[PDB]
């Protein structure tokens, strides 16, 4: 990038240094089963989406 | 823990079915309240003893299978297939010693 | 025009036969792995001549001595401030440094 | 083989060919504005997601 | 590029619209499925079957024209592609905004061999007690040490020029040329302060060199001398397009920067020809030892050219001040030997060799000025929409041909022929439309101006009584009126015109989606016309819009 910018400009390249909030919620009104659709499974799906 | 029970088809011991679980980490073979050498699992109830059905047996390593409808005569569908009529796979060896 | 294909790179770990002590692995040796949707096999080639023998990594250990306070400022043993920390891992590649 | 392979690249699809040609005709290979910088890097460096 | 023998394939089978027999079989299959209750006789004397075969023939003709190559289908009467495409000379080059671009920009001014771009540091001092600023440090009088500040300016230039003339100063005509081009082509928030000739540093080289007993010394001297000068201060050369291609560059790269009228300049050479910071014996020796005929360098030394050059260090490496170019001091010398005997050289012979070696370089820079562009394939032009009526494919017995029908057969048969002509026009008007649609591809995708309609038709005039068959012959005199009357509303022009425009805009990676609602705060229903006009204008003006940012 610095080769293509301008004689006068240098850019810096960094890592995002991530930081983030997380969800909690009211229990689902339905589930396939206590195990098959355990709250833990829902948590895993939520984690994947994020 | 929540990830240790996979399924429970018999929650109140009224019908036949499958219970499936993983052996938990920290399960212990060396104990004194029950004989050593076995992993031990407990089931419990606080109700009168007859609110559940009587048992015939408990078996490990159970597998379910279903009849394939092909161009033949399903004579065995009038009355259930007798017990102990099935002993082997189509391909006899797949690293399995016996099927009951 | 369109751009062409670039080949991928891998590392392989080799273990020699019980009855030999050393061997020479020449450049261009073919390796086999996997097939595409046509059923054709993938082929990889060794990039450099190398020498294989029976040498294995057995143990990994580590130390670190971190110093905050210059020795000349120690006037009494019970200093108000920590002067440094010195730690060890008997098994460097375990979770807690001890085998977990 | 303890680890996955790396550094390979498949031939361009029609969709990528059109995408690449179309962007060069707009940014002229110069890094001036926001779009320019962001698209020059995603085209040049194949293992950057965002 | 020789002529080849020409032949025709023997497997005439494709199972598509160019395959007559295939089409005929499908025709019959459809007939049975739809009408076998009433039409069962499929013998060859049947008028029904006769009509089917004629139509199948007409379909093959249409398919054959659709396959005509693009070079011809969108050709202009006068040749060229003016309203269809932008050429590489116009759409790939970029305004110069980088340091290398500026060097390429100025290096093409005749008389200039090289240029370097440096940044000015103008300093401003400030009083933090009383906010005040000046270029003088007098701004700090009577202040404390913590009340002082300095800032440097961020966008100013100085241009260092190396010329062919070897004079002391730049000609004022060069200063005007450099300032003119800079200002004409500049970045936002940047400026040029000064243009000046590059400063130099003189270096001495002295040596004793033994050469082969059968060697041309005057030539060896000319060659060594040129090679050392090139080491100290290299310069780029111009190339033809053919040469850039031979080097392995592609189109995207060849046309990456500003377009240059004098030939192409290779970026690698340009980067290499930077002002040198260090000179050393390990390179100078290699230059001499590599000249054919040189056997031994018996003595060699470098040194800063200076006065009172008495006993001094070897100076194995000489460093150069930050804004100077090194140059031989002209107090240099090489003593040539054969065996143990010294030989003498003549100045006129050396000058002649040096001149020839360098003059041949000028010849190539000049040749590079002609080959500046690639070829574009050229087609022909031939009214691709020409159509002939299917009525001419029937026999005389039917009575629908140019020679008519003999009077002795009576009126009733003549009347029936009229009825058939009417029926067949339902098939011809459709085919004529498809041919007509090919003739408009150039307009539909035009960068200058598209059409108002998206579907088209034609009058059919190779039928002898069309003036009687049609209720109002007026329409046959103007295909635009005929289109409005026969297709009419079925042509949803606003939606279709937008789809075409959006596609063309997308080809340049642009996007006009926001006009869909922003214009509704200015206009009501009239926005549909306004927006299409603006999109066409955008495409026409695109060459400058995307470049001069």
Strands (E), E5-140: 112-119, 123-127, 132-134
Q: What is the dihedral of CA E385, E391, E392, E394, to 10 degrees?
A: 140
- How many CA within 13 A on the CB side of residue E140? 13
Residues of E in contact with A7 (CB under 8 A): 98-99, 102, 117, 119
The alpha carbon dihedral of B83, B84, B85, B87 has a sign of positive
Instruction: Give φ, ψ of C63 to 5 degrees.
Output: -130, 155
Q: How was this structure determined?
A: cryo-EM
- Please give the helix or strand (H or E) that residue B62 lies within, else none: none
Q: Confirm or reject contact between C24 and chain D (CB < 8 A).
A: no
Residue A23 three-state SS: coil
Which residue, among A2, A3, A5, A7, would best test binding to D if mutated, counting the most D CBs under 10 Å from its CB? A5
Name which of C2, C5, C8 is nearest D5 (Cβ-Cβ): C8
Which one, of E432, E430, E438, E431, lies nearest residue E384 by Cα? E438
Q: Give the nearest chain D residue to C1 (CA atoms).
A: D17
Say if CB E216 and CB E345 are below 8 A apart: no
The beta-carbon contacts of C78-82 under 8 Å, at least 24 apart in sequence, are none
Question: Strands (DSSP E) along chain C, which ranges?
Answer: 22-25, 30-35, 41-45, 50-53, 62-67, 84-89
Strands (E), E267-413: 278-280, 294-304, 317-319, 324-328, 333-338, 341-342
Of C45, C7, C43, the C-alpha closest to C25 is C45
CA distance A50 to chain B (A): 21
A26 HSE (CA, 13 A, CB side): 2
Which of E272, E310, E280, E277 has the alpha carbon at shortest distance from E114? E272
**Contact at 8 Å (CB) between B60 and B73?**
no
Ramachandran sector of residue C27 (left: φ over 0; alpha: ψ -120 to 50; beta: rest): beta
Which long-range contacts (C-beta less than 8 Å, at least 24 apart) are formed by E533-541? Answer: E535/E498, E535/E501, E535/E502, E535/E505, E536/E449, E536/E450, E536/E501, E538/E505, E538/E510, E538/E512, E539/E447, E539/E501, E539/E504, E539/E505, E540/E447, E540/E448
Size of interface A-D (CB pairs under 8 A): 11
Q: How far is the C-alpha of B11 from the C-alpha of E18, rounded, in Å?
A: 71
Beta bridge partners, E310, equal: none
E333-338/E199-211 β-pairing: parallel
Q: At what angle do helices E281-289 and E217-232 cross, to 10 degrees?
A: 150
Residues on chain A touching E96 (C-beta within 8 angstroms): none
D25 touches chain E (CB under 8 A): yes
Query: Per 3-state DSSP, what percentage of chain A is helix, strand, and coil (rounded to 5)?
Result: 30, 0, 70
d(CA E149, CA E147): 7
Between chain D and chain E, the number of residue pairs with CB atoms below 8 A apart is 32
User: Helix (H) and strand (E) counts for chain E?
Assistant: 19, 15
> Residue E411 half-sphere exposure, CB side, CA atoms within 13 Å?
0
Closest residue on chain E to A2 (Cα) = E98
Neighbours of chain B (3+ CB pairs under 8 A): A
Cβ contact E114:E162 at 8 Å = yes
Q: How far is CA E541 from CA D29, E244, E373, E495, E547, in A?
A: 20, 31, 23, 23, 11
Phi, psi of E290 (to 5 degrees): -80, -5
**Cβ pairs bridging C and D (under 8 Å):** 33
d(CA E270, CA E98): 13
DSSP letters, E314-328, are --SEEE--TTEEEEE
- Name the strand (E) or helix (H) holding E158: strand E156-163
The label of the residue with tokens 């002609």 reads: E370
Tokens matching residue E516:
């869909």
- CB environment E378-407: b (16+ within 10 A), e (fewer): ebeeeebbebebbbebbeeebbbbeeebee
Contact with chain D for residue A4, Cβ under 8 A: yes
State whether B8 and A35 contact (CB < 8 Å): yes
CA distance E106 to E163: 12
CB-CB contact of A26 with E117 (8 Å): no
The number of beta carbons lying within 10 Å of the beta carbon of residue D27 is: 21
What is d(CA D17, CA E294) in angstroms, rounded to the nearest whole number? 55
Instruction: Give the whole-angstrom CA distance, residue E83 versus residue E444.
Output: 11
Distances (CA, A) of A42 to A21, A23, C23: 17, 12, 54
User: Across-strand partners of E127?
Assistant: E132, E148
Report whether C53 contacts C22 (CB < 8 A): yes
Q: Which of E94, E96, E99, E189 to mutate to test the interface with A (most CBs of A within 10 A)?
A: E99
Q: Distance (Å, rounded) from C-alpha A32 to C-alpha E208?
A: 96
Alpha helix segments (H runs only) across E67-122: 70-73, 88-91, 99-107
Q: How, if at all, do strands E123-127 and E148-152 pair?
A: antiparallel
How many Å apart are CA E337 and CA E344, to the nearest integer?
Answer: 9
Chain B residue with Cα closest to A32? B7
Could you give the CA distance from residue C29 to residue C16 in angstroms, rounded to a whole number? 16
Q: How far apart are CA E410 and CA E417, in angstroms?
A: 11
Q: What is the CA radius of gyration of chain D?
A: 14
* DSSP symbols for E249-292: --HHHHTSS---TT-EE-HHHHHH-SPP-EEEHHHHHHHHHTST
CA distance E20 to E57: 7
Burial of E270 per CB tally in 10 Å (0-12, 13-18, 19+): middle
Residue A5: its chain D contacts at CB < 8 A?
31-32
Give A35 to chain B, closest Cα distance, Å.
6
- C–B touching, 3+ CB–CB pairs within 8 Å: no
With CB atoms and an 8 Å threshold, state whether D32 touches E98.
no
DSSP, collapsed to helix, strand or coil, labels residue E460 as: coil
Chain A residues whose beta carbon lies within 8 Å of the beta carbon of residue B2: 35, 38-40
Which residues, 6+ apart, have CB-to-CB distance to C68 below 8 Å?
Answer: C81, C82, C83, C84
């Amino acid at each position: 990038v610095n080769e293509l910018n301008s004689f006068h400009v240098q850019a810096k390249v960094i890592n995002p240094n991530y930081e983030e909030v997380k969800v909690d919620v009211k229990v689902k009104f339905r589930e396939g089963l206590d195990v098959s659709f355990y709250l833990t499974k829902v948590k895993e799906d939520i984690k994947k989406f994020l | 823990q929540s990830g240790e029970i996979i399924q429970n088809q018999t929650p109140r011991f009224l019908k036949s079915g499958i219970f499936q679980f993983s052996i938990p980490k920290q399960a212990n073979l060396d104990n004194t309240v029950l004989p050593p050498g076995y992993h031990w699992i407990k089931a419990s109830m606080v109700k009168p003893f007859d609110v559940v059905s009587q048992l015939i047996n408990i078996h490990a390593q159970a597998v379910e299978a279903v009849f394939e409808d092909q161009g033949s005569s399903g004579n065995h569908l009038e009355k259930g297939l007798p017990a102990e009529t099935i002993s082997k796979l189509q391909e006899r060896l797949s690293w399995i010693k016996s099927i009951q | 025009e369109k751009q062409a294909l670039s080949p991928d790179h891998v590392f392989l770990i080799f273990e020699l036969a019980k009855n030999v002590s050393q061997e020479k692995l020449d450049e261009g040796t073919e390796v086999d792995g996997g097939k595409d949707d046509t059923g054709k096999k993938n082929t990889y080639l060794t990039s450099f001549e190398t020498v294989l023998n029976k040498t294995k990594v057995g143990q990994l250990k580590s130390l670190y001595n971190e110093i905050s306070v210059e020795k000349e400022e120690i006037k009494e043993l019970n200093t108000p401030i920590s002067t440094g920390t010195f730690v060890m891992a008997p098994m460097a590649n375990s979770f807690d440094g001890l085998g977990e | 083989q303890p680890y996955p392979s790396t550094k390979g690249k498949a031939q361009e699809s029609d969709e990528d060919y059109y995408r690449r040609v179309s962007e060069r005709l707009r940014h002229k290979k110069r890094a001036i504005t926001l779009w320019d910088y962001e698209h020059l890097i995603l085209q040049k460096f194949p293992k950057v997601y965002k | 590029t020789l002529n080849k023998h020409i032949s025709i394939p023997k497997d005439m089978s494709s199972k598509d619209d160019l395959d007559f027999h295939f089409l005929r079989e499908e025709g019959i299959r459809y007939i049975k499925e739809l009408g076998s209750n009433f039409w069962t006789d499929y013998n060859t004397h049947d008028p029904g079957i006769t009509m089917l075969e004629v139509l199948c023939y007409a379909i093959s003709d249409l398919g054959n024209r659709i396959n005509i190559p693009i070079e011809d289908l969108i050709a202009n009467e006068e040749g060229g592609v003016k309203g269809q495409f932008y050429k590489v000379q116009e759409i790939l080059p970029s305004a110069p905004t980088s340091e290398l671009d500026l060097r390429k920009l100025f290096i093409d001014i005749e008389g200039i061999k090289n240029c370097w771009i440096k940044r000015e540091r103008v300093t401003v001092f400030a009083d933090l007690k009383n906010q005040k600023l000046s270029y003088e440090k007098t701004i700090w009088e009577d202040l404390k040490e913590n009340q002082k500040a300095q800032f440097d300016l961020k966008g100013l230039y100085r241009i260092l020029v190396e010329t062919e003339d070897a004079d002391k100063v730049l000609s004022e005509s060069l200063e005007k040329a450099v300032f003119t081009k800079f200002h004409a082509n500049r970045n936002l928030c940047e400026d040029l302060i000064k243009v000046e000739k590059v400063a130099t540093e003189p270096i001495s080289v002295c040596a004793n060199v033994e050469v082969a007993p059968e060697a041309d010394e005057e030539l060896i001297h000319a060659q060594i001398l040129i090679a050392i000068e090139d080491y100290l201060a290299p310069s780029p050369r111009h190339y033809s397009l053919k040469q850039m291609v031979d080097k392995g560059y592609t189109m995207d790269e060849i046309f990456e920067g500003p377009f240059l009228e004098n030939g192409f300049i290779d970026t690698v050479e340009l980067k290499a020809s930077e002002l040198r910071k260090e000179v050393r014996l390990s390179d100078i020796i290699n230059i001499i030892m590599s000249i054919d005929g040189v056997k031994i360098v018996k003595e060699i030394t470098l040194g800063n050219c200076d006065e009172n050059d008495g006993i001094e260090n070897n100076q194995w490496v000489i460093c150069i001040p930050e804004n100077k170019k090194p140059k031989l001091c002209k107090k240099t010398t090489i003593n040539y030997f054969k065996g143990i005997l010294p030989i003498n050289l003549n100045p006129v012979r050396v000058d002649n060799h040096k001149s020839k070696i360098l003059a041949s370089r000028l010849e190539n820079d000049l040749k590079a000025k002609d080959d500046l562009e690639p070829a574009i394939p050229q087609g022909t032009f031939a009214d691709w929409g020409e159509y002939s009526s299917i009525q001419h494919e029937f026999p005389e017995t039917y009575g629908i041909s140019d020679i008519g029908l003999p009077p002795k057969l009576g009126v009733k048969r003549a009347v029936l022929a009229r009825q058939l002509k009417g029926y067949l026009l339902f098939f011809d008007q459709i085919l004529a439309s498809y041919f007509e649609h090919l003739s408009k591809i150039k307009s539909l995708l035009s960068l200058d101006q598209g059409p108002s309609f998206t579907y088209f038709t034609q009058a059919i005039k190779d039928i002898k009584d069309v003036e009687e068959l049609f209720k109002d012959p007026t329409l046959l005199e103007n295909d635009e009126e005929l289109t409005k009357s026969l297709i009419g509303k079925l042509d949803d022009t606003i939606e279709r015109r937008n789809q075409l425009m959006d596609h063309l805009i997308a080809r340049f990676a642009e996007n006009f989606s926001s006009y869909a609602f922003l214009m509704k705060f200015l206009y009501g229903e009239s926005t549909d016309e306004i927006v299409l006009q603006d999109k066409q204008s955008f495409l026409r003006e695109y060459k400058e819009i995307s470049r001069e940012r």
